[PDB]
């Protein structure tokens, strides 16, 4: 939908190197990227930014996922050996509901 971008992040480093905040039943109902660390996979990619809201991970919606579950989905997506990237559907819009 308008405002969303699919970003494929290569697993170029040993971590993703982002911090995320939010998840279901919080004021930030979909997770927001709050930091991008130098040296991590996300910094290397150049396509993810502080403020991006993550809508889907590898095609799985994060809507309805509590913060701990969303984070675990992303961690498991980074750890898997099935592929050498993670697909994030992100938006630059604020998401408030």
């Amino acid at each position: 939908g308008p405002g969303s971008t699919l970003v494929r992040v290569k697993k170029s480093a040993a971590t993703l190197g982002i911090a995320i905040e939010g998840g279901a039943n919080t004021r930030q109902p979909l997770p927001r990227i709050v930091t991008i660390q130098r040296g991590g996979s996300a910094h290397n990619c150049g396509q993810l930014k502080v403020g991006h809201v993550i809508l889907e991970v590898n095609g799985l919606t994060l809507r309805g996922k509590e913060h701990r579950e969303a984070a675990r989905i992303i961690a498991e997506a980074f750890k898997t050996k099935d592929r050498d990237y993670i697909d994030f559907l992100v938006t630059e819009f604020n998401v408030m509901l």
């Binding site: 405002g3 150049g46 993810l48 930014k49 502080v50 403020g51 630059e92 819009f93 604020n94 998401v95």
Partner: peptide, 12 residues
């Protein structure tokens, strides 16, 4: 430069 501006659009 990996930072978005405040957004002027919000999903409700």
């Amino acid at each position: 430069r990996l930072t978005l501006p405040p957004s002027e659009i919000t999903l409700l």
